[PDB]
Short mmCIF file of C-alpha atoms and ligand atoms in Angstrom, two decimals:
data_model
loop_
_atom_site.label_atom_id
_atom_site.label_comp_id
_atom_site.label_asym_id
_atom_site.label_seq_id
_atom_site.Cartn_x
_atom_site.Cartn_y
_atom_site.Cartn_z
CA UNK A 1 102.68 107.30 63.90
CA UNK A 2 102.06 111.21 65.31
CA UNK A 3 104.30 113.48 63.87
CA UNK A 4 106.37 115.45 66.42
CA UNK A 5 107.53 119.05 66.35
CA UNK A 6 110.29 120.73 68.91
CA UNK A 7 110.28 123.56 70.26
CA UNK A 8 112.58 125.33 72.96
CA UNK A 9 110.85 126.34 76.30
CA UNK A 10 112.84 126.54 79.69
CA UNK A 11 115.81 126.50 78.06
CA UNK A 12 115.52 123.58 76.32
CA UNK A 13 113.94 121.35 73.77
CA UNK A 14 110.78 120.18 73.89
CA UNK A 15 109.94 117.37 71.53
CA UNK A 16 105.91 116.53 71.01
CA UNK A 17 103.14 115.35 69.11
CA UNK A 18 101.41 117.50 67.13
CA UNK A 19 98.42 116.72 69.01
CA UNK A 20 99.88 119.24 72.10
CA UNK A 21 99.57 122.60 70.66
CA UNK A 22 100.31 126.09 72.57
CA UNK A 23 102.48 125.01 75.13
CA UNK A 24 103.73 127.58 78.13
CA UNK A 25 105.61 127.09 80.94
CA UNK A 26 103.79 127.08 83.91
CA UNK A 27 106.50 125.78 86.71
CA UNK A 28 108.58 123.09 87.82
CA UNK A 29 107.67 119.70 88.80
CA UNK A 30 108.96 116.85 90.65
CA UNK A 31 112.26 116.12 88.71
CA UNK A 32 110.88 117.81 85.87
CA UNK A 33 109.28 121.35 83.98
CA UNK A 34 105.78 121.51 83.26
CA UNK A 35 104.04 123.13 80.36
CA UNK A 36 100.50 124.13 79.46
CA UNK A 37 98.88 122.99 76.28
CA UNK A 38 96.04 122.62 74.20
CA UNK A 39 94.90 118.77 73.43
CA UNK A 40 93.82 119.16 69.83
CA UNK A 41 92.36 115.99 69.88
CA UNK A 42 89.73 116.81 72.32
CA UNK A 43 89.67 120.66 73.36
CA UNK A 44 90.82 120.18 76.45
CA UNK A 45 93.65 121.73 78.58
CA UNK A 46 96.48 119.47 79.91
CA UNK A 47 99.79 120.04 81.66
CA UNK A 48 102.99 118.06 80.00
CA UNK A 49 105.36 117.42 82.36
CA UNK A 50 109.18 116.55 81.01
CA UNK A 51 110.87 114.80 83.22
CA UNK A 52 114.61 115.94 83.42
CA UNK A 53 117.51 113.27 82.38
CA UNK A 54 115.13 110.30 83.35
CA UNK A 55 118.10 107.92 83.08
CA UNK A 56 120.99 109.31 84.15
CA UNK A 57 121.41 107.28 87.33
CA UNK A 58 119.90 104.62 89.09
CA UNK A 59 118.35 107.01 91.34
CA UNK A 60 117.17 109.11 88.35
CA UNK A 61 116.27 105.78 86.83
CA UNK A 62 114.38 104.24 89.15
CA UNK A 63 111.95 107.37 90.18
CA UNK A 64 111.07 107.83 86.48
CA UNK A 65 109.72 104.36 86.70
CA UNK A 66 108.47 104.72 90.22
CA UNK A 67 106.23 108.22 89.13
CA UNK A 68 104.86 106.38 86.37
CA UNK A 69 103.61 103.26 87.96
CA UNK A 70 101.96 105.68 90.32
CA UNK A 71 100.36 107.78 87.99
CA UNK A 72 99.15 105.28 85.67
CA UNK A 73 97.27 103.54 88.99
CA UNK A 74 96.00 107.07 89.99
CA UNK A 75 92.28 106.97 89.11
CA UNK A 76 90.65 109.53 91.37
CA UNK A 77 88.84 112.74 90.91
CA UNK A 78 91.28 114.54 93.62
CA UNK A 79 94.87 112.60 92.75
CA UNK A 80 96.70 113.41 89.81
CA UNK A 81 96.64 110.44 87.30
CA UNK A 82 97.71 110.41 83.41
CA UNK A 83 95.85 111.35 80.27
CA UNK A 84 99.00 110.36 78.02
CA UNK A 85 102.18 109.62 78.11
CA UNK A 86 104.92 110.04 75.63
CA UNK A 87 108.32 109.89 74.13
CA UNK A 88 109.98 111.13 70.86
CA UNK A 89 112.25 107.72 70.86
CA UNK A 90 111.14 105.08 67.81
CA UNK A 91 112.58 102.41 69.95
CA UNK A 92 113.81 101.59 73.64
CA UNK A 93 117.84 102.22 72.30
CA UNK A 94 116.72 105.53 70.94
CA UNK A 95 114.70 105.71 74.59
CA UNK A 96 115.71 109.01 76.71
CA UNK A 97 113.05 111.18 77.51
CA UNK A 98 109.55 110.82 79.09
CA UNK A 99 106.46 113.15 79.07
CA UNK A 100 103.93 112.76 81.47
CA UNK A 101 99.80 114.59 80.73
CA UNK A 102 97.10 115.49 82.98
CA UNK A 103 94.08 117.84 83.28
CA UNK A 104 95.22 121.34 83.39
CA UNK A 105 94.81 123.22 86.79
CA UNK A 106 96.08 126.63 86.91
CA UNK A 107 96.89 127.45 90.74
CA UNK A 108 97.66 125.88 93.87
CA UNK A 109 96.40 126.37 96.95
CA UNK A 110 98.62 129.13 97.83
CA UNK A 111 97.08 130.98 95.04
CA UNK A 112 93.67 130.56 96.50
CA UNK A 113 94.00 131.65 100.50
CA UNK A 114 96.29 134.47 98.98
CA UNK A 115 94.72 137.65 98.67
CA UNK A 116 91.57 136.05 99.92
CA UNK A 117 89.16 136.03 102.98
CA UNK A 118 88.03 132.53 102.66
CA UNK A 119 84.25 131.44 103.99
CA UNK A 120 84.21 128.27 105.70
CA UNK A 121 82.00 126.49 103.57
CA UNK A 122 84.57 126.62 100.79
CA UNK A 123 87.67 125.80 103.49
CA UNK A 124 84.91 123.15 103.98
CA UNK A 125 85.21 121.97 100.44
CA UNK A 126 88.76 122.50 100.01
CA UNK A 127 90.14 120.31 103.16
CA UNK A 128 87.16 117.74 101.82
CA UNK A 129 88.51 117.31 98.41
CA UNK A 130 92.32 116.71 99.92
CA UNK A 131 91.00 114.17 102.75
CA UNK A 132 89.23 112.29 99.59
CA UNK A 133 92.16 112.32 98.05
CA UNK A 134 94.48 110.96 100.90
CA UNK A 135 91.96 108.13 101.54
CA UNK A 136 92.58 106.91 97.89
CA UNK A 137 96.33 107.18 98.19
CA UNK A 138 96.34 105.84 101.47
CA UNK A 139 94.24 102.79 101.11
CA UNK A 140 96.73 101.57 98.32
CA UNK A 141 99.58 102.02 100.84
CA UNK A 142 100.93 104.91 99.25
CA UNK A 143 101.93 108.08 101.70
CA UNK A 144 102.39 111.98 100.52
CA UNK A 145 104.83 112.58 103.62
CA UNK A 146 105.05 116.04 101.97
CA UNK A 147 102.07 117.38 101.58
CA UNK A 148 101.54 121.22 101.63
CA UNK A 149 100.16 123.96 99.56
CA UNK A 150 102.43 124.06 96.79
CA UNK A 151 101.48 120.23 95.69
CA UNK A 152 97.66 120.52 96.08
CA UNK A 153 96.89 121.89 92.08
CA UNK A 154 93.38 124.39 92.33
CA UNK A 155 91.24 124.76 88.92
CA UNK A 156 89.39 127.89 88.63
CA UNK A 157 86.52 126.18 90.41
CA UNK A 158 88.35 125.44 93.19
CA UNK A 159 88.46 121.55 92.68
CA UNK A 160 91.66 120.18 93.84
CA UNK A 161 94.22 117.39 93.32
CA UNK A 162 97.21 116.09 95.35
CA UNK A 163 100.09 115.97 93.58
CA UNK A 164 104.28 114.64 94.38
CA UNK A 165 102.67 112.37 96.23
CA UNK A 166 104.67 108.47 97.20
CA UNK A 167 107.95 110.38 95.78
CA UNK A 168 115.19 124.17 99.69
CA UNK A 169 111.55 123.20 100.64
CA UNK A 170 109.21 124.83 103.55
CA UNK A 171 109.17 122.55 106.65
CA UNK A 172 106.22 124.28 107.95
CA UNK A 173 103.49 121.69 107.05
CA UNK A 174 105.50 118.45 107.67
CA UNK A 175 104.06 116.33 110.19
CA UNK A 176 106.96 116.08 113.61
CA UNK A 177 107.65 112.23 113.16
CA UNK A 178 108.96 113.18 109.67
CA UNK A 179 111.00 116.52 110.27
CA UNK A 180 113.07 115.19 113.16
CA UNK A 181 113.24 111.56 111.80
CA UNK A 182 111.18 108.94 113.99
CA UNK A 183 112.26 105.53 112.99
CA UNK A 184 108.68 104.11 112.05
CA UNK A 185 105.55 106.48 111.10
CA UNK A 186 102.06 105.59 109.64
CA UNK A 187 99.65 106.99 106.57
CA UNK A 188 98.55 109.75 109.14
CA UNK A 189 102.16 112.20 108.48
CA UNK A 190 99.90 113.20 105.73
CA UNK A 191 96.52 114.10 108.68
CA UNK A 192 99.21 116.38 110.66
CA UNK A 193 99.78 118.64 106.74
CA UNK A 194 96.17 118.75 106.47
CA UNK A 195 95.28 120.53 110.23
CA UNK A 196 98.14 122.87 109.53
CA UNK A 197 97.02 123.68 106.02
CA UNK A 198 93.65 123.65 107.46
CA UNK A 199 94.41 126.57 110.24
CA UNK A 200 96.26 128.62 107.92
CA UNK A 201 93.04 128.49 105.28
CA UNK A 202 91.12 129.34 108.13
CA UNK A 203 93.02 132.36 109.71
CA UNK A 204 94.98 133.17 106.89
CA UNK A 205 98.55 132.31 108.94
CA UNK A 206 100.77 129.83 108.39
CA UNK A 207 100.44 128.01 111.75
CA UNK A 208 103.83 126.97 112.32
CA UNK A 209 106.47 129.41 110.53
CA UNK A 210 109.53 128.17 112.39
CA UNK A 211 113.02 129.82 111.37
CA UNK A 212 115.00 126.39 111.96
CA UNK A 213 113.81 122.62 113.15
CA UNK A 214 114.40 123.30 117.06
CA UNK A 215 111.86 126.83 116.11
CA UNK A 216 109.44 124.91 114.50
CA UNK A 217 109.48 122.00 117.21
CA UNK A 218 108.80 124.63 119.77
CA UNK A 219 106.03 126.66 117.98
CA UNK A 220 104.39 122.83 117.65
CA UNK A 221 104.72 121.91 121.46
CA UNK A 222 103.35 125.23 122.81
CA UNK A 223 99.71 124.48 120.60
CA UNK A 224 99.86 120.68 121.49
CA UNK A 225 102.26 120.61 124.78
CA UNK A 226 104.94 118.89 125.66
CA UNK A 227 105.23 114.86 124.39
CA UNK A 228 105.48 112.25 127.12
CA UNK A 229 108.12 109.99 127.88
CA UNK A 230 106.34 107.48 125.25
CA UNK A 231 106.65 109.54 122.22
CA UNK A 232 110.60 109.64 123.20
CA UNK A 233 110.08 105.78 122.61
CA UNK A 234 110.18 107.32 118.70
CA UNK A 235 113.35 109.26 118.73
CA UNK A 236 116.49 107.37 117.77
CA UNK A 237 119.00 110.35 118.97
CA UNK A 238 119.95 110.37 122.72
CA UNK A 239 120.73 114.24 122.15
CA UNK A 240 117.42 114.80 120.53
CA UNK A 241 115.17 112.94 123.09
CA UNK A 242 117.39 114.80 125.95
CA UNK A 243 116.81 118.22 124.22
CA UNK A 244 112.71 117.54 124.39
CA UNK A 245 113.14 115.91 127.78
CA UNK A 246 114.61 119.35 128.83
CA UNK A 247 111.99 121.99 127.78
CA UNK A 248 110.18 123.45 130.49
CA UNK A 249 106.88 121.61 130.06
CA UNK A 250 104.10 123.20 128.00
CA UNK A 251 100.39 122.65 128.57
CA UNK A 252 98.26 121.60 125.39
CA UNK A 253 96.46 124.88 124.22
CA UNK A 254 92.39 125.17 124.15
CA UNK A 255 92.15 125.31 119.93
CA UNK A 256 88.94 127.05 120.81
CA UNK A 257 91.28 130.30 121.96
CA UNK A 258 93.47 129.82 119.89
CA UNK A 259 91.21 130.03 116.19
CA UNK A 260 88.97 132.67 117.45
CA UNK A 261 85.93 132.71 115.39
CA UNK A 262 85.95 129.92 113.96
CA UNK A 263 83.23 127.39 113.08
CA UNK A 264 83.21 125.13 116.03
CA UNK A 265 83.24 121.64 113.90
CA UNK A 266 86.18 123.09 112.10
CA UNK A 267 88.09 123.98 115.66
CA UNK A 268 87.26 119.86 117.15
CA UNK A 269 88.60 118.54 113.85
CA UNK A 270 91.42 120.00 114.13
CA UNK A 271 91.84 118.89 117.79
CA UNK A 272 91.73 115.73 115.83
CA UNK A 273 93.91 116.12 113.71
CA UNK A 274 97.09 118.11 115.28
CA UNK A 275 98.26 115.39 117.70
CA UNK A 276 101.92 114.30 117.96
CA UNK A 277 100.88 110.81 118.95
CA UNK A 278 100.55 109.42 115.38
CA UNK A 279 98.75 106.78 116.54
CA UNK A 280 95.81 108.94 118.02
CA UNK A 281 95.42 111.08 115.11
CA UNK A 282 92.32 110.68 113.13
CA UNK A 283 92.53 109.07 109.50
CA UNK A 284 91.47 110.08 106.16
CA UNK A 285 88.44 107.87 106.09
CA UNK A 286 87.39 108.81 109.63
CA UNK A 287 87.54 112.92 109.04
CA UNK A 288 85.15 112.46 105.96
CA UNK A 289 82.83 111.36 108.27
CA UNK A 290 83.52 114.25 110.56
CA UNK A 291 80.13 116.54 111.03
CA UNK A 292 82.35 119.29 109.36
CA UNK A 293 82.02 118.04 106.09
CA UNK A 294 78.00 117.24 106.58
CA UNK A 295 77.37 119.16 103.51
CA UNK A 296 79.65 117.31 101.59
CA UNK A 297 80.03 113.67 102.34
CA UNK A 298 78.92 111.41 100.58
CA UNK A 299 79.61 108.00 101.04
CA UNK A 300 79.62 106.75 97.19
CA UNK A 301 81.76 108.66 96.40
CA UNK A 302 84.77 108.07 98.40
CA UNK A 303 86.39 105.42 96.79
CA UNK A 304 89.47 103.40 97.67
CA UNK A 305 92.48 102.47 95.34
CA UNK A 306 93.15 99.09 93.53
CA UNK A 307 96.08 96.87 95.32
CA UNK A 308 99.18 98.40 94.26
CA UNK A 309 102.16 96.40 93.69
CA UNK A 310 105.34 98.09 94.58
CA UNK A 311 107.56 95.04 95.16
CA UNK A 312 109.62 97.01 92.65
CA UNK A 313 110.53 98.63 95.51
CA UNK A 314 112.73 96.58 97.28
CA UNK A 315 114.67 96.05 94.30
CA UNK A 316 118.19 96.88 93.01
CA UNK A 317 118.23 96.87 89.20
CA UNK A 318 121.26 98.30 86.51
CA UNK A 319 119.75 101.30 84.50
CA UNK A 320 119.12 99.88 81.87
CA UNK A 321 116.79 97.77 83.25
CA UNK A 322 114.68 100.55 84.66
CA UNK A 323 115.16 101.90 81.27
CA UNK A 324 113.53 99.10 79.42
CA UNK A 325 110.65 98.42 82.41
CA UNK A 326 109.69 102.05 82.07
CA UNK A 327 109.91 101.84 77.67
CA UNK A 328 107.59 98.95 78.66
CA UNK A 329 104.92 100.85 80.57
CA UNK A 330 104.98 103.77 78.40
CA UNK A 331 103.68 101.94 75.53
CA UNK A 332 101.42 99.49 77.05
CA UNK A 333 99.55 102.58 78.87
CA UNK A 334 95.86 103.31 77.66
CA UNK A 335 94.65 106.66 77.90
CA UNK A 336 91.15 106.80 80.07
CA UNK A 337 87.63 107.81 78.39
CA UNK A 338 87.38 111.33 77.96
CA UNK A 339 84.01 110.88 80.18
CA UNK A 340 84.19 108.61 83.26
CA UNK A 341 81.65 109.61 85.74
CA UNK A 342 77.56 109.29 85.78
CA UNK A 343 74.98 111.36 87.52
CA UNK A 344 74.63 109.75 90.94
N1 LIG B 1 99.42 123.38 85.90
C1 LIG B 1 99.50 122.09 86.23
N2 LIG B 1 98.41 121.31 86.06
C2 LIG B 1 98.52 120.03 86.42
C3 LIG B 1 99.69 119.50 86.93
C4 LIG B 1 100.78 120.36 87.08
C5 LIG B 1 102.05 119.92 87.65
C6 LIG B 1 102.70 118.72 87.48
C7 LIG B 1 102.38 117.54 86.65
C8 LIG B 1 102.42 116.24 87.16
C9 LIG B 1 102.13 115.15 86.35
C10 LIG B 1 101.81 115.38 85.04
F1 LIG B 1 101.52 114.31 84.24
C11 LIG B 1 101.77 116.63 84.49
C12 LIG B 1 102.06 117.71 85.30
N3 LIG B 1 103.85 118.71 88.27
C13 LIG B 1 103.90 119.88 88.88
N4 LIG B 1 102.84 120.66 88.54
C14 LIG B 1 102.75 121.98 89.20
C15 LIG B 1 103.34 123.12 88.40
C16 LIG B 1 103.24 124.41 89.21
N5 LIG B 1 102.92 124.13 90.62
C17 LIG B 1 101.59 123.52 90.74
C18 LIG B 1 101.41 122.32 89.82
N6 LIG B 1 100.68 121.66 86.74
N1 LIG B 2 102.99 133.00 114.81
C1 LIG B 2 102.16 132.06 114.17
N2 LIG B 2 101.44 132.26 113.10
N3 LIG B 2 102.15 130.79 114.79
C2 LIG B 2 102.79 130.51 116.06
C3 LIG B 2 101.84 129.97 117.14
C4 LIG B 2 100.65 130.93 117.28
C5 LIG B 2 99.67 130.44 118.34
C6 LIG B 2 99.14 129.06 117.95
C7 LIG B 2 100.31 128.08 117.84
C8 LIG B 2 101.03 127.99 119.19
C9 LIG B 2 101.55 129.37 119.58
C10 LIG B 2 100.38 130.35 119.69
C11 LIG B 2 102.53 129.87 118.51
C12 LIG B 2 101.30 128.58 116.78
CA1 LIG B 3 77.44 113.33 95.67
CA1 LIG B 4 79.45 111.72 82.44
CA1 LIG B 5 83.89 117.84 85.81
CA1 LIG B 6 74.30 107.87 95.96
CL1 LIG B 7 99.32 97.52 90.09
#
């Protein structure tokens, strides 16, 4: 049995194994804090997230379990998965607090296109890594829905992972069927954040910086132009759809005038990818294979997910229950080889 220490950080008390040494706060997380630390086990850094008051609800109950079935299927180079997870509790009625590890990575992306000119071979690399990483999610039917900067996690060699993913906040990168609340959507709400994330890498703008919803609608339809009557076929409010019937119509832009200077490739995926029609924007899979990414792609190593069950889901269970199913996956989880990649 490790022997655990406590110490206070954010406030409050952090209760660990020995193992975690050093730990700093480095930010909040989804329903939780996040501290770095040194695994003295192996040498390696790794972020502990604590998740706050796990149990306290049903709601609270159920996306503690819900985060850690999805990280403990997360097995990609570019997702967020687990190297450990922990509690403090000897037993499921002493059972109250969860602690979720990964690799360390210092930034996010914000922290990259910040104070920095960007080429495009390494906006090349960076859009890559996230499309990789949203063809594994997506392929076991799991959806970001909001991806944006602040949840793609940057080492210091640029490699990325997408993070809060299947789970006030900027608006700016959410795709349009989301923000004004279509009543059915597909995997590709997740494409539309990657061209906007995309253009602002590339120009160093955020794309769409709306004020309000109705701002950012409008900044969207003058790139893209007005919707036709089909996409109104989405909209479940009368006033809504009559609003958007009512704008003066807007042509589509030429992307090519509007990202001056641009690598062409870059410009025509992007074409691709920021379309309101849902159905007509390009996938995850199919912009790996986009010539933009020639340098890059490499079909062996693109992997798709395991099936993932969530029929948990569509189920209403008391707290306790949660409680005990989640008990039950932290201590049947098994930490990954420190090594598990080969030369190609
Ligand atoms: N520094 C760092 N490194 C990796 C992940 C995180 C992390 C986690 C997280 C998730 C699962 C887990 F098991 C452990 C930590 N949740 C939010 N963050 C963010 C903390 C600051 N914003 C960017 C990343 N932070
Ligand atoms: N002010 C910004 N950073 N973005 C707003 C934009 C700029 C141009 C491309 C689209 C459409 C239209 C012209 C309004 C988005
Ligand atoms: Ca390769
Ligand atoms: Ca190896
Ligand atoms: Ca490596
Ligand atoms: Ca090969
Ligand atoms: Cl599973």
């Amino acid at each position: 049995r490790p022997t655990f220490y406590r110490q206070e950080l954010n406030k409050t008390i952090w209760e660990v194994p020995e193992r975690y040494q050093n730990l700093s706060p480095v930010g909040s997380g989804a329903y939780g804090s996040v501290c770095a630390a040194f695994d003295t086990k192996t040498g390696h850094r790794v972020a502990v997230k604590k998740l706050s008051r796990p149990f306290q609800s049903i709601i609270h109950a159920k996306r503690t379990y819900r985060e850690l079935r999805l990280l403990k299927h997360m097995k990609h180079e570019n997702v967020i998965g687990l190297l450990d997870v922990f509690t403090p509790a000897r037993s499921l009625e002493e059972f109250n607090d969860v602690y979720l590890v990964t690799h360390l990575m210092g930034a996010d992306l914000n922290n990259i296109v910040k104070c920095q000119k960007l080429t495009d071979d390494h906006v090349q690399f960076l859009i890559y890594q996230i499309l990789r990483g949203l063809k594994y999610i997506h392929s076991a039917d799991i959806i970001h829905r909001d991806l944006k900067p602040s949840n793609l996690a940057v080492n210091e060699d640029s490699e990325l992972k997408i993070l809060d993913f299947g789970l006030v906040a900027t608006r700016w990168y959410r795709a349009p069927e989301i923000m004004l609340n279509w009543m059915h959507y597909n995997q590709t709400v997740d494409i539309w954040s990657v061209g906007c994330i995309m253009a602002e890498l590339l120009t160093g703008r955020t794309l769409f910086p709306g004020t309000d919803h109705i701002d950012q609608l409008k900044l969207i339809l003058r790139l893209v132009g007005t919707p036709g009557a089909e996409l109104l076929k989405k909209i479940s409010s009368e006033s809504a759809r009559n609003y958007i019937q009512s704008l003066a119509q807007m042509p589509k832009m030429n992307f090519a005038n509007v990202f001056i200077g641009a690598n062409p490739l870059a410009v025509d995926l992007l074409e691709k990818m920021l379309v309101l029609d849902s159905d007509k924007r390009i996938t995850a899979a199919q912009a790996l294979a986009h010539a933009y990414f020639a340098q890059y792609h490499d079909p062996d190593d693109e992997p798709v997910a395991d099936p993932y069950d969530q029929s948990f889901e569509s189920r209403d269970l008391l707290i306790d229950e949660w409680k005990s199913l989640t008990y039950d996956e932290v201590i049947s989880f098994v930490p990954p080889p420190l090594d598990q990649e080969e030369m190609e």
